[PDB]
Curated annotation (Swiss-Prot), chain A:
Primary enzyme class: hydrolase
Any one GO biological process: membrane fusion
Outcome when changing residue 7 to V: Increases slightly the interaction with RBD domain of SARS-CoV-2 spike protein
Sugar-bearing residue positions: 35, 72, 85, 304, 414, 528
Record protein name field: Angiotensin-converting enzyme 2
Extracellular compartment residues: 1-597
Phenotypic consequence of residue 13 to D: Abolishes interaction with SARS-CoV spike glycoprotein
Residues of the full protein shown: 19 to 615 of 805
Post-translational modification: N-glycosylation on Asn-72 may limit SARS infectivity. Proteolytic cleavage by ADAM17 generates a secreted form. Also cleaved by serine proteases: TMPRSS2, TMPRSS11D and HPN/TMPRSS1.
Catalytic activity: angiotensin II + H2O = angiotensin-(1-7) + L-phenylalanine; angiotensin I + H2O = angiotensin-(1-9) + L-leucine; bradykinin(1-8) + H2O = bradykinin(1-7) + L-phenylalanine; neurotensin + H2O = neurotensin-(1-12) + L-leucine
Phenotypic consequence of residue 58 to T: Increases slightly the interaction with RBD domain of SARS-CoV-2 spike protein
UniProtKB/Swiss-Prot annotation, chain B:
Recorded consequence of changing residue 87 to P: In strain: Isolate GD03
Region (Receptor-binding motif): 39-109
Result of altering residue 89 to A: Complete loss of human ACE2 binding in vitro
Region named Receptor-binding domain (RBD): 1-138
Species assigned in the record: Severe acute respiratory syndrome coronavirus (SARS-CoV)
Function of the protein: Attaches the virion to the cell membrane by interacting with host receptor, initiating the infection. Binding to human ACE2 and CLEC4M/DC-SIGNR receptors and internalization of the virus into the endosomes of the host cell induces conformational changes in the S glycoprotein. Proteolysis by cathepsin CTSL may unmask the fusion peptide of S2 and activate membrane fusion within endosomes.
Result, substituting residue 94 to K: In strain: Isolate SZ3; 20fold decrease of affinity with human ACE2; no effect on affinity with palm civet ACE2
Cystine connections: 82-89
Resulting phenotype, residue 82 to A: Complete loss of human ACE2 binding in vitro
Entire protein: shown range: 386 to 530 of 1255
Ranges where the BetaCoV S1-CTD domain occurs: 1-127
Annotated protein name in UniProt: Spike protein S1
Amino acid sequence: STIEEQAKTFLDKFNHEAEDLFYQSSLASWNYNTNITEENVQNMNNAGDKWSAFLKEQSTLAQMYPLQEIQNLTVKLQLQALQQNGSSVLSEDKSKRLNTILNTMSTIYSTGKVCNPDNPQECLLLEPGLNEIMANSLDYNERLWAWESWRSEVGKQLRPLYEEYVVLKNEMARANHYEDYGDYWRGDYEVNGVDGYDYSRGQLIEDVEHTFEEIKPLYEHLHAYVRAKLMNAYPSYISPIGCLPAHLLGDMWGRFWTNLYSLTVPFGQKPNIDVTDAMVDQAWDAQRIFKEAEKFFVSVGLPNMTQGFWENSMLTDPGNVQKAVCHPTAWDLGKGDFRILMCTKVTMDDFLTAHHEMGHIQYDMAYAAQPFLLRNGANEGFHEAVGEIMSLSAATPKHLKSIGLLSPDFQEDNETEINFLLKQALTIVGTLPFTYMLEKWRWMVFKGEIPKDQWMKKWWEMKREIVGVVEPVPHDETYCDPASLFHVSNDYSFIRYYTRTLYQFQFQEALCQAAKHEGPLHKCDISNSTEAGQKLFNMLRLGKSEPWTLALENVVGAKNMNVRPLLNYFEPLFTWLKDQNKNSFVGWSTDWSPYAD
Amino acid sequence: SFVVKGDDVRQIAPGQTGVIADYNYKLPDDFMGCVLAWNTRNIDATSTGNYNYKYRYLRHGKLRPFERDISNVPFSPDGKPCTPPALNCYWPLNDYGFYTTTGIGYQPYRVVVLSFELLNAPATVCGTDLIKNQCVNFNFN
């Protein structure tokens, strides 16, 4: 009769119709992810276009409904997610042109390859071949050549498409009445009209800067220590007061830094934290990894995996005729079909990644009772952070003692403690200046603080200023080294990992608040107490029915993002960082470079 | 006999309002015998798709015990007959969507109600040997 009854009626029609169509679309995605054949990608684009056109054509019935008549929030956030057109609202020419240039970048970054200067036959792609040699080689010229060739072959091809990308994408942002596409990233946390639980968009810039100022001294000491160990493992290359060369940071761009550990092990005469060889010793497969992870989920109070998970998902690497991509990703399909695409090796990183993706799927099974476009997180960051919770709690020696590996008399000297702290701190700290810099830089490019011919300059100069990273050879304006990264070329923002890293140690303090934790934050295992599982479950299922502020208050008792949990996690390690590098310089100089000397 | 969603199986019980039991199959108070069910992830669920299985979720008001709701007229929030696909004139019958690859609660259950009535006729549907020269009681047919 009223507007809200037919709004509920159209939305429940949208639930019971969108269930099946998104299930067919993600079945086609799953058939592509378990079988790469051109028949699978011709499956993958039929129902996916029949989902993207479905949201738009039912948005034409959803935008007829006046949104500012509903007092409620539960169906109002439903009508918001439908009345968002997506990316289909521009002129007919520029819409398909921007979506075609995005598809073109998605092709040329993902299939491009590099070739030996004296041999145009030795040609390989990004992953593997480069990134493993970019993690373990002691040769300067090999890592430098891979580093520069990957940015010269496809990044020079990705620069003019990035030049058209910024204009058409900010034109989409203008056509949907946003400031920039940076404001499109600031409008993912855009909760409105709750008056006590709200959040504005420039406040994301506010929060990122104000809580990265607490990252800067810890990262400064950590950057000094890893510069000391990089001058150790790569002698006569790096200035003692300078920055770091961009092909020594473990990966291609300087994002993940755990691959410095074999060259940044503090106390190597002490027993290893990497239990990979212990997983080798009992001849494990992927199956026992996932089942023991699931038993950890039972011990923290989260239920078993259902029949569809073990009857339908792929858990090993095929190799043979049915070849496929193997990136570990969690899949909401609906219809009780929640899957993990993961080709697992016998690795501690794959063990924690099994914990990670099964944490995502447990989160999905928690909010499986939501309405269908609210079958998603409250925001983008709780998914990745809740996934990282199980891996961070599982990586403690309090859990490795409990697996069956590491025979149960494991000592508690501060030595392996500080080694574990520094090894985790490489990743956890060093991802955050690259996150701060990458997101703030793309905010500047889309906003217009950088002219369209100063992108590569301000990129590497803010890598110097913030991340303390120098390129070893100069780049002209033909390059685009940001666009030669995955998430810039394939439509994902990167501040979700920043919010991950903050809510990660927030949920760490909150889940150790209930299980009667005794030591500091580093040794805390959330296992074998299910009250922490209940406290995590009363945010794990809410979805976008309630904001992140209300659930975040119900978890930690705060409403603004805070990194002081990470600081109290790293503070004995921070005293160790102040202790070791007294014979070094703490900081980095942005005028040093391997090409400036 | 009817094949449902697993969430509808608790909606086939006395009490138990639900959504499907409002418009499709109304549940009584006392006139209730047995509820038997088993799973047909092989028969009534096909992994690629079989949509002979539809349900109705829009009708002007709830039902009465064991009412059989068959007739297909499209629903409007204020009557006044529609002309589909005009707006706010929804299809009442939408597909199930239960395949073989689904989970546990979303595999479609065969549910049968044994409706028991007491003695409005003589009893119809319901459920040793001899010894010689011994003083016994009888009962023959």
